[PDB]
Design a protein around this nucleic acid. Sequence first.
RNA 1: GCCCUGCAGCAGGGGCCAAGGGUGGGGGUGUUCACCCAUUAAAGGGGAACGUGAGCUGGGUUUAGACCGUCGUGAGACAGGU
RNA 2: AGCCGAGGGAACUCGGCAAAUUGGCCCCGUAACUUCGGGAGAAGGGGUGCCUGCGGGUGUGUAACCCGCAGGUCGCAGUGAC
RNA 3: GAGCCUGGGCUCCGUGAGGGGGGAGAAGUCGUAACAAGGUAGCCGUAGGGGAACCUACGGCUCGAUC
RNA 4: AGUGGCGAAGGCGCCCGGCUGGAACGGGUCCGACGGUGAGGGACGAAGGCCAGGGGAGCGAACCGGAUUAGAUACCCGGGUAG
RNA 5: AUUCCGGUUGAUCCUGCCGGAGGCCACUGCUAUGGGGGUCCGACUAAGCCAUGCGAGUCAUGGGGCGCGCGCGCGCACCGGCGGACGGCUCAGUAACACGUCGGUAACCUACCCUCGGGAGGGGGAUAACCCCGGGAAACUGGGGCUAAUCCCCCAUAGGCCUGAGGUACUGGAAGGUCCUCAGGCCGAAAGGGGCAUGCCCGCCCGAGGAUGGGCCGGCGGCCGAUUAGGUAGUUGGUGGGGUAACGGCCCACCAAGCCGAAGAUCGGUACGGGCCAUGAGAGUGGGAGCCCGGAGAUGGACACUGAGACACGGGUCCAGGCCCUACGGGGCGCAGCAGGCGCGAAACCUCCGCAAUGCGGGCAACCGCGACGGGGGGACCCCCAGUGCCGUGGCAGCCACGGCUUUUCCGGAGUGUAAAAAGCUCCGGGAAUAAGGGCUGGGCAAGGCCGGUGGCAGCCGCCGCGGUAAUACCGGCGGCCCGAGUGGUGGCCGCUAUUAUUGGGCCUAAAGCGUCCGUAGCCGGGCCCGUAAGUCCCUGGCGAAAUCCCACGGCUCAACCGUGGGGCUUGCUGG
Lengths: 96, 174, 125, 241
Amino acid sequence: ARGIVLEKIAVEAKQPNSAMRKAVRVQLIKNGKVVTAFTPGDGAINHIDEHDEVIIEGIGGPKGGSMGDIPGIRYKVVKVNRVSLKELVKGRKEKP
Amino acid sequence: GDPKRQRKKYETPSHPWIKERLDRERVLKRNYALKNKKELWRHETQLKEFRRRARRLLAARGKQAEIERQQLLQRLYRLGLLPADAVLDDVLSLTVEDVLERRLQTIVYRKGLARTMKQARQLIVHGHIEVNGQVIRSPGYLVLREEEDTITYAKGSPFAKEGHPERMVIEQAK
Amino acid sequence: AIWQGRSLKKPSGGRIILARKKRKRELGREPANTKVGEDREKRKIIRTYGGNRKVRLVEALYANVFEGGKGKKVKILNVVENPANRQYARRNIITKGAIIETEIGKAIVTSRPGQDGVVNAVLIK
Amino acid sequence: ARKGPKRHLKRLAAPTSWYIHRKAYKWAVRPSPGPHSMKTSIPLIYIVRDYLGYAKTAREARKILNEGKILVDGRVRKDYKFPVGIMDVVSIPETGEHYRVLPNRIGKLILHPISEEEAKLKPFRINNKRMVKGAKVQLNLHDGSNHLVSLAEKDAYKTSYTVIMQVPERQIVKVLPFEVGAYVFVTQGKNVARKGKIVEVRQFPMGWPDVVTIEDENGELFDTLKEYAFVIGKDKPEISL
RNA sequence: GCCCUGCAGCAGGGGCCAAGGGUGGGGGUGUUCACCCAUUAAAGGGGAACGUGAGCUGGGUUUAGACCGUCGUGAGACAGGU
RNA sequence: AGCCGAGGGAACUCGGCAAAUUGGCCCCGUAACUUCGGGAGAAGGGGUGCCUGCGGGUGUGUAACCCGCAGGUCGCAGUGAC
RNA sequence: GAGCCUGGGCUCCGUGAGGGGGGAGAAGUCGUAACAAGGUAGCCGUAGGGGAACCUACGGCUCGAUC
RNA sequence: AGUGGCGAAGGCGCCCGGCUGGAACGGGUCCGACGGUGAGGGACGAAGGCCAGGGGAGCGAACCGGAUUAGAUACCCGGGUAG
RNA sequence: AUUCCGGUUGAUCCUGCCGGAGGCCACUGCUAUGGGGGUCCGACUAAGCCAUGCGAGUCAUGGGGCGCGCGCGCGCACCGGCGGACGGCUCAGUAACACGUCGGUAACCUACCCUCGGGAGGGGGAUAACCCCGGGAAACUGGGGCUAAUCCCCCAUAGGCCUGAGGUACUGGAAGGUCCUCAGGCCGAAAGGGGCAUGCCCGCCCGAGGAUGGGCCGGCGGCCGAUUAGGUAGUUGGUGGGGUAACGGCCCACCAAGCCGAAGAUCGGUACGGGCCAUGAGAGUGGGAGCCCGGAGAUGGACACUGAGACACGGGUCCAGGCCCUACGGGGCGCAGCAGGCGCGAAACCUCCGCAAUGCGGGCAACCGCGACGGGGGGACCCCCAGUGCCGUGGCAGCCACGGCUUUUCCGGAGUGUAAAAAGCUCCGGGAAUAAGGGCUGGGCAAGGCCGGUGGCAGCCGCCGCGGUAAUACCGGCGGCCCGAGUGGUGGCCGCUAUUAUUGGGCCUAAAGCGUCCGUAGCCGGGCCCGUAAGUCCCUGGCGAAAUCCCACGGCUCAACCGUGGGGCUUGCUGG
């Protein structure tokens, strides 16, 4: 699914782990519904601005849902303005 | 409904990372100079089809079952895997190494036309080998029993010359 | 339009939804209400499904009356006792099974004049 | 939704009784109506182009047919959609060739070569009898054709007998009756192209058809439908098979 | 119709002459008043026995009937409500 | 004390005061809620005259009373006034 | 016989002053009902009572210990 | 008075008399497969609670007091309405 | 391969769910050398919207005119005939005799085609083109004069239909169905046209049959819901009629009270059906877009003309809805046909060449046309076969170097091929030159106890769990493992799962025996004899399209593919 970014946020990891997982709120262009999605990588959140368009897929978990120590996040970011987060995080390509 | 698409003629393994199987297949690949595991798997699949046919036909009643028994035995004879006085239980004693013996690359190495399996492969692919008069460029052709003694260098081919240097080197082994 | 093709209820009482438009070959036409005429008799010629013909009789004056082999052509007076409807003897409407008065007595109609184009009858005793 | 009759035939939907490569092209020739049924006949162009080989393309075949060089039961035929069927005689005089159309044991149509003396006769099975105006008798035959006979000679003809005729002129000779020692050839069914001698006939009630029991050369007995049993002789084939 | 201005114009603010003409329609409330709505050049205010019941109306103004609350032993009361 | 009133339709008034609207019979159809008895004629919709002919119930009955159908025809309007 | 108008019958959807429960959450308070005879043995059903875990009565179970 | 007995279960204990339901044993008695289970459906069904009419000794939810207790809306004690 | 591995405890055996490991379909990240074959490429979201141009014609052997040429020919529009009802596209609606299979119509229609048997007589008329005037912005359209036919009309005769009375020739399982005779009536043919030549070819009308293509009927079979229980009023049937091509409440008048249903009616939800497909050891579970058969639709919804056939996919009339031209008086169009653009959305190609092959229509034919079809172009659609070097020596433990060989692929050419091209194939010249990545590396699970960095923050993580300053688990370097022109990520179906259990599970304490009894339907039912043959078993006849599945042989270098044969499939139906 395609969406637009509204706000960057952070979520607390469940105990006994301790960390702030970076995330972003996304409004879906299909129906206007708002969901939360995770940004994987070290520094991925530095490459995402507001009002950017983003591609959303599943995070990969039991029964098509949540994963690991993340509470209540079901989705994951793949693309930013038609560019791969993996390549952005490494440093090959540049965000347009 | 739906129409049928073309399907693969090989089957992959059930578990990918089992050590005994990996060792066996590594040995085979290395020794017969295969490029991938697809080839080994497709020869394994040939053998498995023969075996399944024999299992189905064994202790069955009717006219078509008899016809198909005789067809299967004739085909294995013609391919060079069983003799003529062979019974249907002898099909269940075959191994993949027989099917690997029956391919061009192996036969060209075993006759002495090449020093090695990889050299045999290159000869075939570059077009230096003839079977029953016809150039064949596929190193997995599965030579038939009555084509084996007709395998030679192609008529128009450097190695046809009794004095080619690489052919001298090749013959020096024998 | 007179469709004449299929019922919209099942024998159980359930509703049927027609899953297609009406086809031209299903249709019918209006009845000829053959009446006893006064001066002239009228016929219509009708073109039918395979390029074929029918003849509708619209006003009748004469009749062919039969009495044991022999036939006579005569004139139609009053219609008496059409058992297919009460209003038809009053409106002087002729159909098969109607009883008629002729110069030579009472006769029962044996033909279908909206399909055949003639009025044939058998004399009563 | 179709609003009228078909004018096209897809090659995968063509009859089984044809020798035809079903996957090579999309379309096949659709047969025009005529002497036989679609399940017992093939167009002329397939004979001229595929079965014999005197042409490679349909234009060449059509030129051959329009020049007037193929005869069927002794009559010139120029339509490439004309259907040829069982017992028909195909003749080419520029070559001297003469064939009879028959079925295989699989159920397919083949050409059996014959001589010029036998290319003058054709048998017909009588399928029905009618009275027509003038108190005359019409015989309705197996290829859909019709022949007239008189009252006085009406009892000599019945609805599973066979009549041998000179074909272009249609003169009768050698009526053959359905009997219990008659020699029979089978035209349809599982036992197509088997032959032998009638042994027995059984009838059934309420519209179900009649069955015939036959004895072949080797002595094997078998069964088929009376309407599938084609009489060709009294004890020996009047024609070659 | 004129004067001054922290009066560029369009406008504003403050003052002088001037009472000849205009100053209306609706919503809730018994209301005058006040509040609100849409228009309007603007929708000024006062006096005449708070102009006008031998002109109309009678919604309000606790006569006689009745209910609630509160006060009072009680009969009863309330510049309280209905 | 009574009759009519173009275009608007409660802007009147404390308040639709007063006036208007509906209206008889037959057929269809009928909400919430309910102490299951009702609500209910709920609401809402169609039809209705004259003449010509056919039929039914009870009856001994072209005696008498009651119940249906079809057709033709006139009018702005047929419980045409009451 | 479209389409317009009108009174109808189901379904889905979108909002509402104020009210009601549930689920998660390094970490706010009041007590300590349950596990030992858990400090009055525990539990079922019904009814009444109480800031809250809870208490009491009638009838039942042992999935209850000691002499 | 029981590790006892009867009853489909719930549940049933002073004596005597009357009316009635079911089971076991014994049986060269009668009928001659009439049987098993049973959706839906019906009948019975501890205590407690409700309606109407009576009755009310003892016990005793609620409630009212006295002690204990950091606190006691509980356990203990004395009374007592429904039941 | 008829399979197991990790996870609840301080340790153990169980129950039970989550996860791993395999296959197919769709989207996507990174990366990519070649040839061949195939039924792949806006189905999921919008059966949403547009511009330009194409997709259906043909006949001088039907007729008149005009022009260009030389009484012969070539062309232009016109009248006339046949076709335009096929092909192609899509799956909105539909739970239905729509579909499948077996049967039936003795209750029906059918232009083009085949066979047989018979016919072509006598008379009339008009009008398009053309000429003289025009009207209107266009779309379109008026008047006057003239003229042909296979155009149109009339008369007759053949012929057709209805009814009544007789006879008994035919078929069939079964007849007033056909035939013969009589009678009373209604309707009512035809182009003796064209070509050749001194009889033949192409056509016209009537009759009998067949074929082809359809209409109608029946028996059997195929989803979910009871937090949908009563439904039906021309409704069920009868008598008599109308209408239809034809049977029939299809419609009408009259008479009755029937029809469906707890073995699930009615109502609602969802959906085109099948042949087939995916998966699995199988039993089974799930799907049904692309190829074939059938059905339905052409902005939504209705109604008609012409014709053998339409209520018409490139035609007509109206209402709604939208869009466009306009001199403002009025006119025109719906892209679910091909190519192209927009939008919607995670998500889908050239405004290309040709009628040479297969077929269709027209034509005596010769031939004409066809966005069907064929051919190429674009695209990590599916499948097959290959490449990215080989040999020897020295050195290490796959690499560097040395010396050689080859040319599938690369570059450049000549022929063949092709409708024309292109690719492919044969040959020639040069030259190791031109061509590897993706994921993983604590355990499940193959592979490092090696370096630098960071430091319960940053980050990893299908599940178990790592990281808190000595990190085999984060980031990176170096090594190594798996697969390999591919390899990873997300979602769906199958399997895993004996977690739906017929094969084949469980209910004292783990989820689970109604509180107990009586009994309705249904399911299960003791022993012997006689009969029957419905179930059941064997044998034989007629059906269950082709494609798709298995086997062998043969043709493309083998193969994929195609062909020839033998079996199977269609869950079954029917005569003996």
